[PDB]
Write a protein that binds this ligand. Structure first.
Ligand SMILES: Nc1ncnc2c1ncn2[C@@H]1O[C@H](COP(=O)(O)OP(=O)(O)O)[C@@H](O)[C@H]1O
Ligand SMILES: Nc1ncnc2c1ncn2[C@@H]1O[C@H](COP(=O)(O)OP(=O)(O)O)[C@@H](O)[C@H]1O
Lengths: 566, 561, 211
């Protein structure tokens, strides 16, 4: 059998307890959770900065549940006998608003054998402070508006519409992408935050609503603004300064340690997601384990689990949908594996489509050995791996005064400097004669370019192979950065890279020892390939170069130029 | 002919399926997502080019929805507050009756009959409402203006979101809807109910707002690669976070089953166009040959069915003009020429103008002159004469390879890869010369690495004084170890050679399956697929001991494998 | 585009009339009749109205009486209201919504040709609306400015069965609404104009005809 320790024994998630309140359902953002609790108690504004689907809105909703619920109010607007264009405002305990209006409305009907106040905000029946999401709202929606009057017309007070700031009175006002609001909206929000009251007035100068401006309307909200890294510098400086000086700024984390306790929380995660969705079956232990395996793969950091839970939640819902279509009673591993494929976001679908097309015209060799030809590995996007064949040949120098290392493949800056670090090793073991050769290296078919330094050890191997005439095993693939002292440095996407080797039929893959905990392979795939974690360039060469006296002499010669420390 | 996995004489014999989901051609991922989503009422976002079947998948999803549970929506007068008409939903067909009940009382008389907003009585399929481009009042509902007076409830009009209650609401180009309408759409999605009110503030309908009206629709939104970045953020997060996202494929595997779908496709296109005759079998085969050439991908068929449908129609129009009873292969061939993409007419125009002032030898042999082949755009080739001459180095310290022709970045690196091979076989003497290579008359530039073997041949010929056959044309990329790499547009390249009267063409072996020629053209040219640079040279260079020595020298610097 | 117009049928041309809607003033009703009939119908109602003031008069939106060939309507550079139709504002006891209805060039092109050069310079919204008109062959007239009372008026769909002849130079291709180009491409033809012809005796003879 193949399983993981989840810190709890269960058959299906139906046995897993789901915390009652939202704040306890938030996983892995301990700091953000502590800020929200303090902000809810001390009534302070918050700015949440992070990637989408990281729980910013969830936190805003959680804060709402932590606010007092026994003094909620209704907001009424009445006609002003003394100044029709300044409708009067009144707040009363929740549920009272409906009664007051109902009462006046009945009298008005009766009398026509009287003016009726309008209920702007009705909080009757609320068991918790309001959560108002004003993300992307327009000026009138956010701050309130007053309809135009074509005519003998309509009383100004009943043309008054509340803004989300008013609906958020004694609750939470959530605004993601806060920096995309106009400067004027951000200034007005700031004013509302300072006064806790904000008059409603018509937004369009061309409307008769423009001359109507009610008494200040209560808007005692706790603001929970959100956005990504660009938001910081684009938002109204005065608004950011206000939150910063009277509240908290939080940067959302994207990973959490892969500990037994944290996995146990992911068990809770699947359960709360199934419960919140209400349209999917419960998950068996194997299915939850697959969810955890996905969390490890999506972390992008060894020893950690992802906190991109909107995405992982998408996989939970898709797995359930698939189970339902198959008429199953519980979601199983097979359903999760199928959900991962079916629920890929647009970005990964494009990356995979691209790599699929490239592989159809790939020139990969996986049997025998070749001089100056090595199978490197590349990762496109987040998870799209592909074998990266690289070739090298040695020629007499075109210039009588110097030897050059000429590399092609549209390399970006990091890749180009990676080749320079490699050349230091080459020049050192080869010696003075190096100035007598031009070494041409070619990353085959990289028409969209080469980025990063993960092909460092590959270039080194191809070049050393070409210089010495020692063939390179084609059944070997490799990836790894390199230091000028010969140390193999870590790379990103070890799993996607290894999966590409496996798909291509490569039997052995070399990776930095630093990345051994970044390898996530099912029992099945693990049996198809031998993984060699390495720390130094000489170890890469002893695995990749074909055996001979020539090779052993080469290794000895190279080891002579590397530090003993290595 | 070709195997189409179905026998028939004309498309008139081909049966177009019952289920719309079955009609959809080659978007297997999308089809499975639609089936999985319909079953669970999950929203779906389809991203792809126009005419790729987005609307089709939306209609198909409506069909996969329950029908026995549809409901009618009625709006009633509200005695307490006229301006807030009341809403009642009941099982389908029950709406029509409830209306007459009250209507009878009208006779027995003050009695205000409720209005039937949405009537699904008699529907066999869940509703499919295409709200693409709708204005606010049409999408969200409206209340007619009253100069005086008519009862408010009677002036209420359902929005498409309401007509789509328990059905599918389809919106292509969703990101072009005002951010405000997108907001209302979001709310309608969140609550599954949305109050109807007057949209224009110039109207008295604006003082009316009904009770939230049910709008439990499944949203199938559509757009292109720019849509997600442009739509209302709250709407975007909702869809990206809780629905399925699908990128519409642009090609499909070339199998018997898929070709069969292309037959069905032709059949459907003739039927819905209604202005053209049916297609014989060979005509359909020609449509498939086109699907193959348009894939620009060996072993695949194109999925820009809007384009294929364009050829079908142009072929039909040609059949009609000639007074033919059926569309035949000949008609389709003329259709391809008559309805080509403006991009191809442009490339063809350009190639035609250039041929007028072109230097082209197609017989004999020449030292330092090779007939390379270039592909302009996606499906138009032209012979690319490349010349090389060897001169004394201008610098006594280094020899150089100077290439002209306005080469882009990839073409320049291709030249560097070629110089590796030249330097290796030529030895140290190479630093004693300046090799000038010229892509003749390439005033709009040279792009890509498809001229790699051509440059290698021209340079080797010039260095060795070995004439190159002019009745040979060639295209292919190259690795520093001498391996010939694949190129794009192998067919258009070969076609240029045929049009130029060149008898032999060299192409990489890996592109062998990218060659799509009719029997007529195939018999006019000899195709030589190659794997390594020495094979290119043995075909293109004139026989001589000089050439035999060159090949021996070359093969000595290439891998043995 | 003009040549194509001369090749279209000319015996079934119609007149387009807009009438007042007793049941919903903001949705004027539309009626098409054989060419020349429109003028008569209006003339008739107009005379009765005059008489009665000791009645509402329908408005003739498109009058094709006397045309010997299908209309050629050049909408190059036209604004939204000119292309798709508009409804004038009402300052006041006012003017019936139906007589404030103005036809768009798409309507005038009903059963004729709608020519639009520099098609890519039209706003995206105009191109989307044109696409809709092409698909339905009918397009309601509504006020273009939200600030106008014409904005709340939206007539029944008005016929606009035109054959579109869009034009432009090489930049047009990539700048126009992709859905519009795709529509023409899949249900019509794209043509690249040549700039030269062979210098043959036959072609010179045509230049004689040209002068
Ligand atoms: N840290 C987390 N713990 C639990 N669930 C989370 C977390 N982050 C995201 N989610 C889940 O993701 C869904 C989407 O998150 P959301 O709050 O909308 O993200 P954001 O506002 O940052 O885009 C949540 O409603 C919940 O199901
Ligand atoms: N995948 C497909 N399978 C079958 N027909 C297709 C496909 N894509 C496009 N078409 C054909 O093209 C016409 C236009 O497609 P449509 O669904 O309107 O595309 P989109 O909504 O993406 O514009 C269809 O009604 C049908 O005739």
């Amino acid at each position: 059998g193949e399983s993981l320790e989840l810190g709890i024994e269960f058959t299906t998630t139906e046995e897993i307890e789901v915390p009652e309140k939202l704040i306890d359902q938030v996983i892995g953002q301990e700091h953000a959770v502590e800020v929200i609790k303090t902000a809810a108690n001390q009534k302070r504004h918050v700015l949440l900065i992070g990637e989408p689907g990281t729980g910013k809105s969830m936190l805003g909703q959680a804060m709402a549940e932590l606010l007092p619920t026994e003094t909620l109010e209704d907001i009424l607007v009445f006609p002003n006998p003394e100044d029709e264009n300044m409708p009067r405002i009144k707040t009363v305990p929740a549920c009272q608003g409906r009664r007051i209006v109902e009462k006046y409305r009945e009298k008005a009907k009766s009398q026509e054998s009287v003016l009726v106040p309008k209920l702007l905000v009705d909080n009757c029946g609320r068991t918790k402070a309001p959560f108002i999401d004003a993300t992307g709202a327009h000026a009138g929606a956010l701050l309130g508006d007053v309809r135009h009057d074509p005519f003998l017309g309509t009383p100004a007070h009943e043309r008054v519409e509340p803004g989300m700031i008013h609906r958020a009175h004694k609750g939470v006002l959530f605004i993601d992408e806060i920096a995309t609001l106009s400067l004027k909206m951000q200034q007005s929000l700031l004013t509302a935050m300072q006064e806790k009251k904000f008059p409603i007035t018509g937004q369009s100068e061309m409307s008769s609503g423009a001359m109507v401006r009610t008494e200040p309307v209560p808007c005692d909200f706790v603001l929970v603004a959100a956005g990504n890294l660009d938001t910081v510098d684009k938002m109204h400086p005065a608004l950011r300064s206000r939150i910063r000086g009277y509240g908290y700024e939080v940067y959302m984390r994207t990973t959490m340690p892969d500990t037994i306790e944290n996995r146990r929380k992911l068990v809770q995660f699947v359960a709360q997601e199934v419960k919140r969705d209400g349209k999917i079956p419960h998950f068996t232990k194997e299915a939850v384990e697959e969810i955890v395996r996905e969390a490890q793969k999506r972390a992008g950091r060894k020893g950690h689990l992802t906190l991109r839970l909107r995405d992982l939640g998408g996989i939970v819902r898709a797995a359930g949908d698939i189970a339902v279509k198959k008429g199953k009673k519980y979601v199983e591993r097979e359903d999760v594996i199928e959900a991962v494929k079916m629920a890929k976001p647009l970005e990964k679908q494009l990356a995979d489509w691209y790599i699929e097309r490239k592989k159809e015209y790939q020139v990969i060799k996986t049997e025998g050995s070749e001089i100056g030809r090595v199978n490197g590995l590349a990762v496109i996007g987040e998870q799209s791996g592909i074998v990266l064949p690289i070739e090298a040949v040695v020629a007499p120098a075109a210039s009588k005064e110097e030897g050059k290392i000429i590399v092609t493949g549209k390399l970006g800056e990091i890749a180009k400097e990676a080749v320079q670090n490699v050349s230091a090793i080459i020049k050192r073991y080869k010696g003075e004669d190096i100035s007598r050769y031009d070494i041409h290296v070619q990353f085959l078919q990289t028409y969209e370019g080469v980025e990063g330094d993960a092909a460092s050890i590959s270039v080194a191997t191809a070049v050393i192979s070409a210089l010495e005439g020692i063939p390179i095993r084609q059944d070997v693939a490799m990836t790894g950065s390199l230091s000028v002292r010969g140390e193999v440095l870590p790379i990103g996407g070890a799993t996607p890279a290894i999966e590409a080797a496996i798909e291509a039929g490569i039997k052995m893959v070399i990776i930095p020892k630093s990345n051994e905990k970044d390898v996530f392979l099912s029992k099945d795939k693990a049996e198809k390939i031998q993984i060699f974690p390495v720390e130094t360039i000489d170890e890469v060469l002893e695995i990749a170069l074909e055996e001979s006296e020539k090779k052993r002499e080469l290794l000895r010669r190279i080891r002579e130029t590397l530090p003993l420390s290595l």
